[PDB]
Amino acid sequence: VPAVGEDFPIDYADWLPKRDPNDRRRAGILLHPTSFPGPYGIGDLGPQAFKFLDWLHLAGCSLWQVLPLVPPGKRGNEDGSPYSGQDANCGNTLLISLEELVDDGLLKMEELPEPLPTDRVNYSTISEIKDPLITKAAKRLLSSEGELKDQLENFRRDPNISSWLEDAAYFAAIDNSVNTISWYDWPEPLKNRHLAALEEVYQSEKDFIDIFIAQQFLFQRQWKKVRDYARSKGISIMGDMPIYVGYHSADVWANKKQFLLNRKGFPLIVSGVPPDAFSETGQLWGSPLYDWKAMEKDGFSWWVRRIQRATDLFDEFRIDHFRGFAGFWAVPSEEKIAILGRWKVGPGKPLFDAILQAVGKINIIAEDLGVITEDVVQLRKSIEAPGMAVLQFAFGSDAENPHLPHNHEQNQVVYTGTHDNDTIRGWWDTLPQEEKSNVLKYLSNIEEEEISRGLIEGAVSSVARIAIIPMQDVLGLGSDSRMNIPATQFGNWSWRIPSSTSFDNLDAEAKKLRDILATYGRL
Amino acid sequence: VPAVGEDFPIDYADWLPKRDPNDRRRAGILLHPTSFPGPYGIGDLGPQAFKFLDWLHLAGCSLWQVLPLVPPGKRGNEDGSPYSGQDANCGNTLLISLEELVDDGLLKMEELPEPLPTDRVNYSTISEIKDPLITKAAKRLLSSEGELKDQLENFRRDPNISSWLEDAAYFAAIDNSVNTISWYDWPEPLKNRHLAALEEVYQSEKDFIDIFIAQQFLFQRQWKKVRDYARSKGISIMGDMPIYVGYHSADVWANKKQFLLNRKGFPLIVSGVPPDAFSETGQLWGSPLYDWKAMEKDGFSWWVRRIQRATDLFDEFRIDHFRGFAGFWAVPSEEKIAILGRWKVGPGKPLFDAILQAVGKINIIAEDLGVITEDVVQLRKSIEAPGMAVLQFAFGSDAENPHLPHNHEQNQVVYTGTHDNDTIRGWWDTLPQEEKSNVLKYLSNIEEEEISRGLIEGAVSSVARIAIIPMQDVLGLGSDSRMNIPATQFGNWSWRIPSSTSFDNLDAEAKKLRDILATYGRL
Ligand SMILES: [Ca+2]
Ligand SMILES: [Ca+2]
């Protein structure tokens, strides 16, 4: 601008204030694709994904949130959990659409199963039904010589893809052949990745490895079709990543010096959270911990690759236990409970500086629920990451509760509830009378019969730039539709949209949401 | 904090996030003291001020907003306007309580007038009634020899006070003696402040000057009693200052080189705003403009003194036309309309840097209504000043309207309406049907009979850290109680709380406000 007291240009009054597109107010729906209806025992990236995205577009939503898309752990009572994955980078092959593989010519219509029970995912039977079909398709792809063969070859050779996929395929092949609980007990030449032993693995487990890679290609191609369709409708996909990875994975076995292991590969210290005046002992998660000091020395190369793959799948994503980047709880690996542990200093902002330098800007959402310390808030604000507000947590303390709408901020994501909460109606059903009275008073004395509308409107009318509603609340469902209970081992991750509910019969729900998105400026 | 990967102290989880007391959520009432009830034709700093502050305390309010406390212009149809003051620094002597002067022994009970009509301030008669009484009191103070005489002497000699008061008293004395419309036409030795001519003024106008100074002391002492009482009840007082001062004042006459005048003292350019597709021509305010370039050279000493006096009266204050600090509209002084003018570059952040350096931190509120340019937003954000939201302006455009609550931010002041808007009920009465339908839909489909409660709750439930309600809305009043209409010359600044309404009969109103301040975290 010119010097103080001098004339501005004649057109000064045209310099109107800039709205940054990064600040655009948006609404989205939380729906894991396993929850899609259809006849094959589990939701998939096929016809229902496209009908869902058409419904989201009709509703005026510009975001879709999913849980992690990784292959869930099969190897406890973590049955179907997206947060106990077998690999940080692979896609769950159970999300692969049998109908899309028929369209591709990789499966015959006659090979599809007769319609399976539609109410709930049965994680104890679904792998035995779909796995053989996904393998048949991969084998037909590997023997084919067209366009899809050429795409498989470009995928397998892509240096971003091969940086995790080769290790993930060889890990799976060795796990399948050796079949110990963990790689800690593998024969020394496989445990310690002797170059000759790995060459021998590829000769004796060639078909296993080729099929695993072809399955990952089939996932990638289906997911890219879904994401391209979403982008065509003005919809971004928000994903989710746990901060930690599981010990028994390619992530650890192929990258041992990224973790705090002893010279035999056993974790020195593992993840958890301490007591916070909660049931004497805290939580023993038991993941290996990162050697953040070693990571800093190579520019956090392992974390940069993890983020590159996340941006390959997602427009934006949440990191669970974001607080772990400022300070993390470390339990000696011999301990059977979390009590005996220490807070260690996390990597802080330099991790995010290195990601920015290598990958450019990413919308990372900081999962920041529970007790967090001032350094966590200072880290989050330092990288301009939004945190979370969850309305189901807002009404049980005082007016200083951060989840109450008058305490929200613009750079924040507001939920009615997540996959870890009950539905609005289930939560209401078990809520104490005093808290119910508090909720109704807060939301301008609305009636108890309209609690669902009141919380949904409470999220949409927030200053928070992103509002996310679980599909279960749009459908008006109760506790039988909850996705996860945090303390349990069974019944979780299995909710599906009922077979009787179809996206083409939800025009009324789409209009009801669209009207409040219009009113509160999210359209 | 220790090095990455090392232990934190054992007490890490006790480092909970810091709530800055500057961010505390507060509620206040807009009530100019002229509006206080009582028997002497105008509200004053006496018994009703204390009853008001007791009511505000009972209501849980922690702020009181007033208009400028300066002596209003008597010398047009600006009748009683706080924004056309005779001086930037003096207090309005019409706010001086006759009852408090009786308590002081400066007036006799027998000298007080018989009760005057109570409904409205009559600016054409109130000066002729109160001025002679305030003069009698000042004369008794000047002839007294006690505690109050000693306080008058300490006041008159205080270097902050004397920096504006001596000039203001000599200006008033010369204006009274010479009695031209403006000082531009004063005899040259008074116009140009010849040291000998000023010495002669004090000899021939000694009583006038001494009385003017004693009246300003009586104002100061009454105002300080009110502010001390407010602070005793946890109440801050928010004041208000126009960016510009009037030509015919001590501000200009004693500080000519602070303004853009010609060598005879006539303004080169004057203030206004251009057309913005509004009635062809814009607004010709006609104040002199600051020589911001000359001001920068002495560290903005004139502006620093203006702020010092504002902090002497107020805990915090709004600056009207804050945009003028980034860019201001300048009209050649010969022009009779605003059309022909140019935008000039304002002083920007260095003015605020100099104020910070000289006076320390002040809560300045930026009046930022109407069309403002990006540089105004960037200046405001650069000094972390809150702007305004006014709910009565929120509902007539689209969902991107900045006055709508989903567009508010934490560092902001939200009003239902100011002294320039109608009351909520008056505004409702003249609102078009389409806009009414829009308002009711926005506020969760409340009924039209509860519009006042709906807007008040809309302000209190905002994320904006300060919410201000006009006393007229608490009392449920209509258009007959509006303080100012922006386009008019008559009927303004005259509203009083009716004689039949007393603060001790408003317990129900105080509880109703207190309950929503509790709910929305402003208590
Ligand atoms: Ca096994
Ligand atoms: Ca005169």
UniProtKB/Swiss-Prot annotation, chains A, B:
Gene this chain is encoded by: DPEP
Chief place where the protein resides: plastid
GO annotation terms (biological process): carbohydrate metabolic process
Stored Pfam families: Glyco_hydro_77
Enzyme Commission code: 2.4.1.25
Subcellular location: Plastid, Chloroplast; Plastid, Amyloplast
Organism, as annotated: Solanum tuberosum (Potato)
Keywords on record: Amyloplast, Carbohydrate metabolism, Chloroplast, Glycosyltransferase, Plastid, Transferase, Transit peptide
Protein family according to the UniProt entry: Belongs to the disproportionating enzyme family.
Gene Ontology molecular-function annotations: 4-alpha-glucanotransferase activity
Catalytic activity field: Transfers a segment of a (1->4)-alpha-D-glucan to a new position in an acceptor, which may be glucose or a (1->4)-alpha-D-glucan
Primary enzyme class: transferase
Entry's Gene Ontology cellular component terms: amyloplast; chloroplast
InterPro entries (alphabetical): Glyco_hydro_77 (IPR003385), Glycoside_hydrolase_SF (IPR017853)
Expressed in which tissues: Present in leaves, stems, roots, and stolons but is most abundant in developing and mature tubers.
Known role: May act during starch breakdown to convert small oligosaccharides into larger molecules upon which starch phosphorylase can act, or may change the structure of starch molecules and grain architecture by modifying chain length, or may generate from starch and glucose oligosaccharides which can serve either as primers for new starch phosphoenzyme.
Name of the molecule in the record: 4-alpha-glucanotransferase, chloroplastic/amyloplastic
